[PDB]
Structure formats: C-alpha cells, structure tokens
Amino acid sequence: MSAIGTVFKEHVKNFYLIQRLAQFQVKIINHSNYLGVAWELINPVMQIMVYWMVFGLGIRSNAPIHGVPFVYWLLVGISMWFFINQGILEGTKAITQKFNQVSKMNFPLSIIPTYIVTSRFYGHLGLLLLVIIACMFTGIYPSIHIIQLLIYVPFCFFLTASVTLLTSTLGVLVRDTQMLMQAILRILFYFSPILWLPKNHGISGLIHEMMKYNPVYFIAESYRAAILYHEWYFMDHWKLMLYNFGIVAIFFAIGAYLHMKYRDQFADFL
Amino acid sequence: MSAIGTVFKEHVKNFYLIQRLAQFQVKIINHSNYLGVAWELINPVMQIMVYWMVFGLGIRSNAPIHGVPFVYWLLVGISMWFFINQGILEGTKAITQKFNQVSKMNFPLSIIPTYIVTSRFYGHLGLLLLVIIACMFTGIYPSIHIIQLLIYVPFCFFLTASVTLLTSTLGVLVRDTQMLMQAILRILFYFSPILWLPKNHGISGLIHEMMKYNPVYFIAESYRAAILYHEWYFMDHWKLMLYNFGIVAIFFAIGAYLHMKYRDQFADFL
Amino acid sequence: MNVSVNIKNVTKEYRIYRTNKERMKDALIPKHKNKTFFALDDISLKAYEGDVIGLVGINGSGKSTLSNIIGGSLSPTVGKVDRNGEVSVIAISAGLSGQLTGIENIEFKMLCMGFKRKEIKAMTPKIIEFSELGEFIYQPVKKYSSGMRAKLGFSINITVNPDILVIDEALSVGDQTFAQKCLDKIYEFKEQNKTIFFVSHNLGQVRQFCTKIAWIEGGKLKDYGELDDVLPKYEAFLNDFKKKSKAEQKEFRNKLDESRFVIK
Amino acid sequence: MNVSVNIKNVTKEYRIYRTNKERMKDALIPKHKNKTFFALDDISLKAYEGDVIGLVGINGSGKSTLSNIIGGSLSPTVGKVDRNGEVSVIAISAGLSGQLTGIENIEFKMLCMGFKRKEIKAMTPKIIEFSELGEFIYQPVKKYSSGMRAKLGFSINITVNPDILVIDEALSVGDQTFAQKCLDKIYEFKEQNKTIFFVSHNLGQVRQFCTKIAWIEGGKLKDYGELDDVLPKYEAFLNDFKKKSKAEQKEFRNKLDESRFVIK
Numbered sequence A, B: 001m002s003a004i005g006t007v008f009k010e011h012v013k014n015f016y017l018i019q020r021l022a023q024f025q026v027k028i029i030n031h032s033n034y035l036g037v038a039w040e041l042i043n044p045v046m047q048i049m050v051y052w053m054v055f056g057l058g059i060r061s062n063a064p065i066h067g068v069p070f071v072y073w074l075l076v077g078i079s080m081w082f083f084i085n086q087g088i089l090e091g092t093k094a095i096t097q098k099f100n101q102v103s104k105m106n107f108p109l110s111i112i113p114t115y116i117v118t119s120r121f122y123g124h125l126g127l128l129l130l131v132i133i134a135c136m137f138t139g140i141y142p143s144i145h146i147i148q149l150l151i152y153v154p155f156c157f158f159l160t161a162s163v164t165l166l167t168s169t170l171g172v173l174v175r176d177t178q179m180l181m182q183a184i185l186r187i188l189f190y191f192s193p194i195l196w197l198p199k200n201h202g203i204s205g206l207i208h209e210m211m212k213y214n215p216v217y218f219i220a221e222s223y224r225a226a227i228l229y230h231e232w233y234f235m236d237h238w239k240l241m242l243y244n245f246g247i248v249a250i251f252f253a254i255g256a257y258l259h260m261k262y263r264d265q266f267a268d269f270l
Numbered sequence C, D: 001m002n003v004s005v006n007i008k009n010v011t012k013e014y015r016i017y018r019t020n021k022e023r024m025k026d027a028l029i030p031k032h033k034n035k036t037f038f039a040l041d042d043i044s045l046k047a048y049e050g051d052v053i054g055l056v057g058i059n060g061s062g063k064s065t066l067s068n069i070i071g072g073s074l075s076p077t078v079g080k081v082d083r084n085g086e087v088s089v090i091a092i093s094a095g096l097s098g099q100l101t102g103i104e105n106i107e108f109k110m111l112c113m114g115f116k117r118k119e120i121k122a123m124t125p126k127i128i129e130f131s132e133l134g135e136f137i138y139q140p141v142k143k144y145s146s147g148m149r150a151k152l153g154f155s156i157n158i159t160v161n162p163d164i165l166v167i168d169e170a171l172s173v174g175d176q177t178f179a180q181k182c183l184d185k186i187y188e189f190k191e192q193n194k195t196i197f198f199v200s201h202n203l204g205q206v207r208q209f210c211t212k213i214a215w216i217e218g219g220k221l222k223d224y225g226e227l228d229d230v231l232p233k234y235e236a237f238l239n240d241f242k243k244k245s246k247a248e249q250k251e252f253r254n255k256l257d258e259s260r261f262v263i264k
C-alpha cells in the first residue's frame, strides 16, 4: 500500500518533467536523419501498406467486413499496435540503458519507463488523427459517439505504461526476459481481431473465446465502435471493460511493489 | 578495377581475423544472459512456431504441398531468412557503430560488415543442422543430392555479404537509408515462396513471374530441392543460377567501388 | 560547528563471480556462498562547516566509492551517512549528449538536476558567459574538444549552488587559465562556509586548494586531519614505496589483496 | 639525422552547419557555401630521431588534431605527412569493453592492433605482470576503477614496441608509483632512439620527461625548438594572460575566433 502510494505521488508531481524528457528523447532519436521527425509517421504508414497487400489483396481477395471496406477496417484496427509494441519493447530496456546518467543526480526512477512511453505516444496521436481524416473520403463522417475516444485513447496508454513499470524492473534482474518479451508480442499480434475476424461456430469459436481474454481485442474493437460502427460500445461489452480495468490495476500494483522493493539495489544487479 | 582488386586482397588476407572478431562479437552480444549463446537457437525456433500456428494451422487448414507435410516444407524454407534479415540489418550499421574504436589503429575497413555477417552465419549453420536432423522423423533420409548444399549454402552468405558492403557505405553517407532497409526486407519476406506457393494461371501467375526475380525465391527453392525433393536443381533452373550470380557480382562491384571512393572521408561524414 | 556530513560505519561489499553461470548457481540455491571483495570497511568521518577536505591515496583505494556514497548514488551495505544540505558531485567525465547542442545540453542537464523552467530561463546567460565557448555553444557537443566539454560541464555544475560540493579529478584536462578561474570560484565558495571535497593527483593543486587531508589505504581511512600533518606522511610513504624492490612492492600488494578478499 | 616524421603544409578544414537541414540544402545544390572552421593552418614540422617533443598550448589549440593526423586517423585536407616507422598512440581514454575480462581485452586489442596469434600467446604474461591488477585480471573491466583501466591500457600499448610513440594526456589518472614506472619505461624507450611525443598539462612532468617543445596557438605552430627557450615564453604568456582584465581576455578570444572562422 506504501509502494503504490509512492509511485502515484511521483508520477503526479513530475508531469511536466515526463513530457519534456519525452520530447528530448524524440529529438535525440531522429537527430541525424535528413527527413527528421517525419520518420515517426512514415515508418508505420508503410508497414500498413504491406499488411494490406498480403492480408487484404492476397488473402481475402478484397472482400468487405460488416459492410465496411477492409482497408478502413484494418486502418482503424492497426493504429495502436505500433505504439504498444514499441513502447513495451523500449520501456523494458529503459532503466538498464538510462540508469547511469541520472544515478549520480537525485531524480525519481519510476518515471524512466513512462517518459520513454510518452515519447512513443505522440506518433500514435498523429497517426490516429491522420486515420480519422482519411476515413472521410469514403463517406464516413464524425459523429457524437466519437466522444468515447476520450475514455478509450487514454486507457491504451495506461495499459502500456503499467506493463513497462513491471518489465523494466524484471529486465534489470534477469536480462533474458527482455528477449522473451519479443516473442510474446508477436503472439498478441496474430491472435487478435486486427488482421482477421474469427469465424466462430467451431474450433474458430474456441479461438474466439480465447482471444476475448486479449486486451488488444478490447482496444481494437472499442476504437472501431467509436469511429466506424457508430455504437455505444460500453452498453453491450461492459464485462470486458471491467476485466481490462482489473488487469491494468493488477499490473500496476505488482510493478509498483517490485520496483520499490529492489530500487536501492539496482546498481548491484546492473 | 582497382577497387575490386583491393577489397578482394583484403578479404583474402584477413580470413582468420574475420573469424575471430566474429566469435568475439557473438560472445559480446550474449554476455549478460543466463542461458547465453543458446539464445542464438531459441530465438528463431520460437518464431517458426508462430509462423506455423498462423499460416499452417489457421490458414491452409494444414494441407500438404507437393506430397510433403507443410511443417517440413516451411522448416526447410525458413532456415536462411533469420540469417539474411539480421545480417543485412546489422551490417548496414556496422561501420557507423564500429569506426571509432578501430580508427586510431590501422586495420582494414572492408571487413567490418563481413565479420558482423559471420557472427550471424554460425546460428544459421546450427539451425540448418538441426533442421536436417529433425527431417528424419518423417521418413526423409539424406541422399546423394544433398551434396548440392556445398554450392548453395555458401552462395547465400556471399549474397548477404555483398549487400552489406554496399549498404554500410550508404549508411554513413545518408542515415535515412538504414530505416528504409527495414521496409524493403519485409516485402522480400511476403513475396517469396517461404510461406506460400503462388497459384499461377491468373493474376497469381503474374505474381509468380514477378517473384521469380527475387533471389530469396532461388535460395529457398534450391534448399528444398537439395533436402526434400531429391532433384538436381541446376539441371532445370540454370537460368536463375546465372541471373543470381550476375546480381551478386554487380552488387559486389558497386559496393567495392563506392567503399574505396569514400573511405578516406568517413570521419567527416560520420 | 555543525556537521555538514556525518558518516557512521559505512561498509560496501561486492560479490565476486568468475562467470555468470556461478551467479545462476547461487541464484538457484541460497546456500551457495562465494568470495566477497570489501570495497570499504568501517569508515568513520566527520566533516564540519567551512572545510575543504582533500582525499589522497593510491589507485584502487576507494576514494571514488566514498565520494559516490556521500553523494547518495551508492547505497552502503552496512552503516549510514547524513548530509545537512544537498550535495552536488563533479566527476572526471561529465554526462553530456554529443547529438544535442550546448544550450540544449544546458536545458537537459538542469532539468534532470531538478530545476523548474523559470530558473533555467534566467540562469542560461550566466552559464553561457562562464563557458567561454562562444559560437560553439550553437554546435553539437560531439564537435567539441575534451577541454571544452570539461569547461561546459564545470560551468553547468558550478552555477547551481550546492550546499556541499564534491569535485573528483575534474581539473586534470583544463589549462592554467581555467584553473585560476576555478580557484577564484573556490575562494568564493569558501566564503559561504560550504563544504568542498577535492580529489586530485596533482599535489601542487592539493596544496593550493585544500585545508584538511584524509588518507585512505585499502578501503580504510588511514589518517584524517590537518593537511600539514597528513600530507608529509603520505609523501614519505610514496618515497619509501619508490625505494622498495619490485618483489617487495609485489608482496605488499599481495598482502593488501589478501586483506581485502574473504570468503563469507 | 633521419627524419622520423615529416610534415608538409598540413591543413584541416571543418564545415559549420547550424542544422542538418542546411547540410541537406548544400547537398542538393553544389553552389551553396557555408562558413568553414580552420582546425589547422599551414603547419610545418620536422621530427628527428631520439627526440622527445612536448606539445603545449591552451584548450582548443589543435594538439589532439595534430597527434591524430600524425597517427593517420585523420586525413589532411591539404598537405602531407610521412613517417619512417609505424606509429602508436596512447590516448586519455583507452578503448576497452567493460563486458570482456582483462585477458579477453588483451587478446581483442592485440588482434585489432594487427598481431598474429603466436605473438599474443608469448606476450600475454608480460602484460599481465606489468598491469599489477592481479585477481582482477579475471573479472570484467566494468568492475575496474579508472586508474586500473588506465594501467591496463598503458600496459597493453607499451608492450608492443612502436617505432614512434604519441602519448596524449594519459598519465593524469595514474598515481606517483605508476608515474615513476612510466618514467623508467620512457628512459628505456629513449635508449632506442625512438621518437616520443608527450602531451600533458602538468608542467612538472613536461620538465621531467621531454627535451624539446612545440607551442601551438589557434591552430598554428607558434614556436618549435629547445625546451629551455620555448617553455619560458609559454609561461610568460600564461602569466600575462592571467594579468589581463576579463574584457581583454574576452577580446583576445574573440580575435582568435574571428581569425579561425571564414566564409569560403
């Protein structure tokens, strides 16, 4: 109960520091490129193209899902994946890479994964705005239900942050876990409604019931309901909302406890 | 004609240095892991599993190709991909990352991409031996035709090396190219006979005729002919062999010329 | 006579493992034990106000460990250490990013130190003037020479006003012109009664800068007191060591190694 | 009287770009021109055999650039430089990997230097004995202190026998005991008539070690000759600079900056 409290107070107090360090990191990563921070948008946009040529043109022979073209379905479902993947992968190594520079000074160590995740949140916001703009050319225009994004866009961020707060700590204790992380992420890409929709009524029905436990399922479906389907998502699927809230709460609690427990002996392990 | 000659003499003379520096790099990368160099084998083996659960169990409903189970078809076709991908991606950044340490000393700079590629060749050899061992449980036993590997396994290495010898140089001149490289590699994964076989007689026929220009097509098919199909591959498809030899020759020539041209001004650009 | 820094029975152990597999073996079974290297042992120090203390010793003594523990970057295995004010440490290699420019480095470092923006806006000119870099304050730090990077780091660190300052081998690269200005800054700091620690291998600078001397041998504070007493003993020890034969120096080093190492 | 190193009209230009976008602009159009910073200008040097030359100057003079160009790591924009033998350079920070152990670092560095294995096998013990690290030769370099890393780097570099040796600010961290041993090694090297360059900010060590002095000001070799002539002039210049007012020193630095910078 003390660890959760302490981490909460640190994150509440150092908001501006988190933002500014995230901006500095975004500046650092793209320093030598000629195009610069534009590569924060070009990199995912190209990847989607490949995922449309393979799974949309090759497989599916370009057929519609729920009366919507597959291109916009996939575009809305894919927007958060790059942010989630990159944020988790880099926040796992954040403390290991950045401990030495700030160890000599006094500076809260809980925010090291969060500011690196914030460095990746900006590209997600830009891509999501671009997606909403591009969805207009079909005839899909913004509605009232889009206000649901105010609940759904933050949640995704929170989820990612929580995971890093745990994994970063483990990354100091055992290095191998970092490698393991990559594999897990790949599974969460393919057992998700991003690229395909489970057929149900069969073994695919069991696959559907197993995919319902993936938080990526909830995030993708809620985004689609807010932008595409014109439907209040929380009316029919509030059980998923409660389950996901419980998942993020448990992740944050365990990560905070573990981080506070080993914080003083980080140099010995590192 | 002088640049090609000079690079050839350097690589011929520094063979043992290349091997030993490759071994040191393999040692360095896996230093902190508990399992150690075992991760050079666990990492690809797990990925194949995912590529079998998605494309083999989900899509295709586990159907055979050419009378062979899909699992062994995919296993033989996937063995070189991780080596090619990692070698190209890291050899692109090799000179940029390693120039400062060896700049003060006198040490041939042409072998910097090659020893990093050699660090990745060892895992490919281990995985290929494991694949050949595991293919025996079906009833497929080694034959005379496997001697063809003596021509096919080296060629792949050569191809990768040539590409790096070019890209590394470009990576110093323009950083953005490094980023671009990633995208290109992804395309070469999906327009290849690794995961799927083009259906021909249609638009898929045009896709087949376009994929025949991919060197990965030739490498994968030749490996399968040597290990699985029991057939002298060069008897029917020698035109592909000549085209691929020409491709690697052109790549090596251009890369050698460019590397020798800008070698003295690397510090100014870097 | 307020004690600026107080030290009680500080002790730092480091566990020796030949290979990471031995680390795995002791992680699996808690009953495993390995040899332990004692970086420090039973150090007791009392630093007063308006005091300049110079730490002297041979390589591997444990002065950098003590300075880091005083700065709080390292946690003692056994013991405690308290400081009345806030401590700032100047090291041999300042932590700067070669990609960022001079002003960006000032902003980054002062944010990481714990300064809100309004202070940074008013404090930037003074640091820029003190650095003496000029036009190069606009170019990235990777273009700098080692002396200029040291000048920038010292300028950033000194402008923020520490209650306690710990300089560790930071003036080796600076020229005499910068050394005189640093000496004047040390005079100004001495005016404010703040406690300053000075670690240097230049005995002339230790004579010119400090007023008290602490002498550490093999992770043990050998002699703490006035410089006029401790420093001649250290010089006599150095001359005697220079007079010994190679075998005698080797046996002295082996005896120190045996004293530091233990299995527990 | 063989000239060990000969220098003809060496000149190093560095192009100043405020942002990478300006670099893109000049890359697109070859007609674009930007201000150029002259690291060196019209340097002519002649080093004989059995000579110890100390380079002296203020921060930003261009001594490290000259040592790097002599070592071949940097290519001159205009001019040439030839060396009779093979040149070895000892720097302030030796290039070592913290993950590898001491013996692995010896093997890695001696392979990268250009030694075949058979020499390494017979040369390892001597380096191990000279390092004086002992048990720590088995542990990774990241556990070392700065003095011990410097000792290991110096031991590796000195054991290979250079025809020409260039030491640049490498003895700042070592203690007096290591400094005496390095001085004896310099005596042994002087016996073999090899040319040694010594860069240091400790004037006592320059007096004790060197025999000739070169003095560089603003990327220009101000005075080359016997130490007994050049060194008093450098000391007089330092004292005069210390006597000037802050505005006068600022205007001198501004004049040097204007002289070095140009648009061409």
Ligand SMILES: Cc1c(CC(=O)N2CCC[C@@H]2C(=O)O)c(=O)oc2c(C)c3occ(-c4ccc(Cl)cc4)c3cc12
Binding pocket: A053, A054, A057, A058, A059, B055, B059, B060, B061, B190, B191, B195, B196, B197, B199, B203, B204, B207
């Ligand atoms: C079509 C396709 C199947 C389906 C397939 O081959 N299957 C599975 C069971 C039998 C059925 C068949 O025989 O058609 C597949 O699995 O991967 C693919 C990958 C990995 C593919 O990457 C790129 C394409 C592609 C892109 C554009 C255009 Cl214009 C044309 C193609 C592409 C198609 C398939």
Ligand SMILES: Cc1c(CC(=O)N2CCC[C@@H]2C(=O)O)c(=O)oc2c(C)c3occ(-c4ccc(Cl)cc4)c3cc12
Binding pocket: A055, A059, A060, A061, A190, A191, A195, A196, A197, A199, A203, A204, A207, B053, B054, B057, B058, B059
């Ligand atoms: C089956 C499948 C289609 C085919 C599909 O959905 N299509 C395309 C046109 C209509 C047809 C259909 O409606 O069935 C697809 O595209 O991606 C998939 C991805 C990305 C998948 O990842 C994992 C599975 C999977 C793995 C194991 C088991 Cl036991 C079961 C599943 C999986 C299946 C498909």
Ligand SMILES: Nc1ncnc2c1ncn2[C@@H]1O[C@H](COP(=O)(O)OP(=O)(O)OP(O)(O)=S)[C@@H](O)[C@H]1O
Binding pocket: C014, C015, C037, C039, C058, C059, C060, C061, C062, C063, C064, C065, C066, D143, D144, D145, D146, D147, D148
């Ligand atoms: N992680 C570590 N594990 C084991 N020994 C260590 C570790 N870190 C430092 N040491 C040793 O602790 C001793 C004292 O450390 P330092 O304070 O850095 O050395 P030092 O006394 O400052 O000598 P200098 O800095 O070269 S003058 C040295 O023998 C180091 O090798």
Ligand SMILES: Nc1ncnc2c1ncn2[C@@H]1O[C@H](COP(=O)(O)OP(=O)(O)OP(O)(O)=S)[C@@H](O)[C@H]1O
Binding pocket: C143, C144, C145, C146, C147, C148, D014, D015, D037, D039, D058, D059, D060, D061, D062, D063, D064, D065, D066
């Ligand atoms: N890539 C570069 N672009 C522009 N200027 C540079 C570059 N590299 C070095 N310089 C400048 O060149 C000048 C001389 O470089 P150095 O030789 O490293 O300095 P120095 O004379 O050795 O002074 P020290 O080493 O601090 S005593 C300095 O003013 C550097 O800032």
Ligand SMILES: [Mg+2]
Binding pocket: C063, C064, D145, D146, D147
């Ligand atoms: Mg130290």
Ligand SMILES: [Mg+2]
Binding pocket: C145, C146, C147, D063, D064
């Ligand atoms: Mg220098």
